[PDB]
Design a protein around this ligand. Structure first.
Ligand SMILES: O=c1ccn([C@@H]2O[C@H](COP(=O)(O)OP(=O)(O)O)[C@@H](O)[C@H]2O)c(=O)[nH]1
Ligand SMILES: O=c1ccn([C@@H]2O[C@H](COP(=O)(O)OP(=O)(O)O)[C@@H](O)[C@H]2O)c(=O)[nH]1
Lengths: 367, 367
């Protein structure tokens, strides 16, 4: 019934069986929903996309390895073409280029533009500055952007005061006076049936990319080593750790989730950029607590999913030597009741049950 | 030309190639009939339904994984909407919710309401109590409900007097004074070609789920062991027996049926809840007799399919040790003539031949 134009993320071709974090998770979740309600989707994507049995009218702009200029102009041209022959209820985007945003405007779709975000603002990165520059442009044009969490919305009010040598073009006057995200909640997960919380083993799991700068996974896997038999780490091969930390590489996501059901806790060591944190909600939805490394006075999505989360508190000056010891101490000394597992699973059930999720989507997809 | 509103079962999305029992079988068979007579069908279903080539005007209420409250209110809203624009000859229902039944009444369709049932009354189950509560409500509102067998209608006169802590809301006064089902069966089976009754081997077959509580399959497989070479058991993997009872797991249904053609008898050990009993009619339609374990003074579908069925008679207090011995004795001592095979096959052929099945449906779908 809904007619929708869909402009995807541009890092990798779409695959429904991919499970990772970042923008790809948002991309998948929005698309999956639209397919579930039988939307007529004009998907301006890449020749190497796959959709399985999903009904999608595909408009390829080229084979994707690295997104190119030619591809972008093909995409922009296609936007305008399609908008001429079809009446779209909405156009969906995933952190689009300047050219896409301009094309949406010229096509007359700016006021039905629904944009979704995941990448934190990082002034040092030319590419990310462009992303947020266009988030500002979308707001000026009268489109709407949506954040997965309240944490991300709080971070956005910090982002407007962050500058660098690369941010001279950014309209900070406009940004500071206009919160770029809409107030409405976004369904980061969808629970169709009320979860059956299983009792804990002693096993604690880290389901994180090996990334010392962003996620401080070295700290995580140092705690894993200290746990011995009661500790396991999962890493993708694309973000594998050094040999000194044995982990399970590229495990089927389903098997990780199945194992997580009976875990005592989840290790999460991303302190400063906890904007979405999918592995946290993956755990808490099953009743599993997160042992969260975090900066003092920083927002974090984990505390949103479970207010009672255990905090291992640091700041940017805390030496690695201390951080490891302090975090390892929290992990080895971790206790948690079965009732607390039921409680935290219930809170997430109350928020992200199917009926609540559809209501959330409805508010997003309103003209 | 005939205009019908169709409210489906709610456990799984509709698939025409699904070949399970229960309410889904009734759902499929009623829909298939309506399609066969070229009915104009407004189907208030789920986005993930599929219909193949069948002509159906689909009115989705959401993607179905677990039926939700939101879906139910969407469905109820759609009922009222459609009834405002269209004059329906019938509205078809599959064990509906309170909300659906109320919606049908408010829409002014209660007197053309045709409801179909399959689930036996179980006072301990909150969900099933709701189902039968609404069966009562349909009768009060002036709709009509239909049972698979005469046995099911006899069971309904026992259901009147069954209570629990969950049945305080049930209007037992009304129920006891009003048999809920109409006199016509809905056709549980359809025989397209007359079976040619083949002479018996000595082989006796149990085609039952391993379920000691409901079907007392342990008793069955104890008789199988006593038969030795002249005994075989079939079980699905979802209801497999212990190692002590060797059986054939997840055999193609067609192979079981093919084998059954030359069997001396069929073992059926469900004494209490013989409401439909598909394996009984599967056997008797091929001329194969059933050796039926049954409670004294209890109805049973087997005796409906073949009045002359041999009864192994027990009650609830009979110890398992005795029941096994008594049933094993009946199995080993079983004799049966070829003429009796022809006779029982003929009776079932007369009742459930394709043309008779159409006639059965026709009587149900009369104003
Ligand atoms: O070996 C692994 C480790 C993680 N994950 C999944 O990858 C996602 C990681 O996303 P998250 O938001 O937790 O972190 P990010 O990678 O975006 O920093 C989660 O769904 C994890 O369960 C996975 O599939 N395999
Ligand atoms: O290994 C097996 C055992 C049984 N059945 C079929 O499953 C049904 C079981 O009988 P029925 O539905 O009467 O019993 P219920 O399972 O409902 O108690 C019949 O159609 C059997 O032929 C089957 O396909 N495979």
């Amino acid at each position: 019934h809904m007619k929708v134009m869909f402009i995807p993320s541009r890092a990798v071709p779409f695959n429904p069986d991919r499970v990772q974090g970042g923008l790809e998770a948002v991309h998948l979740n929005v698309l999956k929903y639209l397919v579930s309600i039988g939307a007529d989707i004009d998907y301006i994507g890449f020749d190497n996309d796959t959709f399985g049995d999903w009904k999608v009218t595909h408009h390829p702009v080229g084979h994707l390895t690295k997104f190119s200029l030619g591809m972008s102009y093909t995409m922009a041209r296609k936007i305008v073409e399609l908008a001429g022959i079809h009446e779209y209820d909405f156009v969906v985007t995933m952190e689009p280029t300047k050219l896409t945003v301009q094309a949406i405007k010229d096509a007359g779709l700016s006021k039905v533009h629904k944009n979704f975000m995941a990448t934190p603002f990082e002034p040092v990165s030319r590419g990310i500055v462009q992303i947020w520059d266009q988030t500002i442009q979308i707001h000026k044009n009268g489109g709407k952007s949506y954040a997965p969490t309240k944490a991300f919305r709080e971070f956005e009010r910090k982002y407007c005061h962050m500058t660098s040598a690369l941010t001279d073009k950014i309209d900070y006057d406009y940004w500071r006076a206009n919160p770029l995200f809409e107030a409405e909640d976004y369904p980061v997960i969808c629970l169709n049936e009320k979860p059956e919380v299983l009792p804990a083993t002693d096993l604690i799991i880290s389901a994180q990319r090996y990334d010392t700068k962003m996620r401080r996974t070295d700290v995580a896997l140092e705690a894993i080593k200290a746990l011995g038999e009661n500790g396991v780490g999962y890493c993708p091969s694309k973000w594998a750790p050094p040999a000194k930390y044995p982990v399970i590489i590229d495990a089927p996501h389903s098997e990780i989730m199945e194992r997580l059901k009976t875990a005592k806790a989840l290790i999460n060591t991303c302190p400063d950029t906890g904007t979405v944190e999918n592995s946290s909600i993956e755990a808490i939805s099953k009743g599993v607590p997160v042992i969260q490394l975090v900066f003092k006075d920083y927002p974090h999505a984990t505390f949103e999913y479970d207010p009672d989360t255990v905090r291992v508190e640091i700041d940017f000056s805390t030496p690695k030597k201390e951080v490891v010891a302090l975090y390892t101490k929290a992990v080895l000394e971790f206790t948690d009741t079965y009732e607390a597992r039921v409680k935290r699973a219930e809170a997430v059930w109350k928020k992200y049950n199917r009926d609540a999720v559809v209501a959330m989507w409805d508010k997003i997809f309103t003209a």
